[PDB]
Design a protein around this ligand. Structure first.
Ligand SMILES: [Br-]
Ligand SMILES: [Cl-]
Ligand SMILES: [Cl-]
Ligand SMILES: [Cl-]
Ligand SMILES: [Cl-]
Ligand code: NA
Ligand code: NA
Ligand SMILES: [Re]
Ligand SMILES: [Re]
Length: 129
């Protein structure tokens, strides 16, 4: 599913990301825009053989099982395919674990480079919320 900006803001709010670990809703919308272009089916293969999945491009080295990242972990206890669903619940619940691990939203390279320190509240303006 390819979300619109305001549609995703509303879904992220419904599914519990608003101010999770102190990160306002716009941080998450901005991160999703630049990680996945709001596409739940986004995937990116890294040159280490791991893959990033879903609207927040969650990586198979630590967070999900894809059967093709040898020796990796699955801390979210999910198949990586669950991160591609039109329902963002699994991505949200896994993102909650990631952002809680000590590094906050710096786990998301696009957030650090393109959202951190900007007026992230802009990403939710004009939306029915
Ligand atoms: Br949803
Ligand atoms: Cl694996
Ligand atoms: Cl699995
Ligand atoms: Cl933090
Ligand atoms: Cl915000
Ligand atoms: Na990325
Ligand atoms: Na894995
Ligand atoms: Re939707
Ligand atoms: Re703003």
């Amino acid at each position: 599913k390819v979300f619109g900006r305001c549609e995703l803001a509303a879904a992220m709010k419904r599914h519990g990301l608003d101010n999770y670990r102190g990160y306002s809703l716009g941080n998450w919308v901005c991160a999703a825009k630049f990680e996945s272009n709001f596409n739940t089916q986004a995937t990116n293969r890294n040159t280490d053989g791991s893959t990033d999945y879903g609207i927040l491009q969650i990586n198979s080295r630590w967070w999900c099982n894809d059967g093709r990242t040898p020796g990796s972990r699955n801390l979210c206890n999910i198949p990586c395919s669950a991160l591609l669903s039109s329902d963002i619940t699994a991505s949200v619940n896994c993102a909650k674990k990631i952002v809680s691990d000590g590094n906050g939203m710096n786990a998301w390279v696009a957030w650090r480079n393109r959202c951190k320190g900007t007026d992230v509240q802009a990403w939710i303006r004009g939306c029915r919320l």
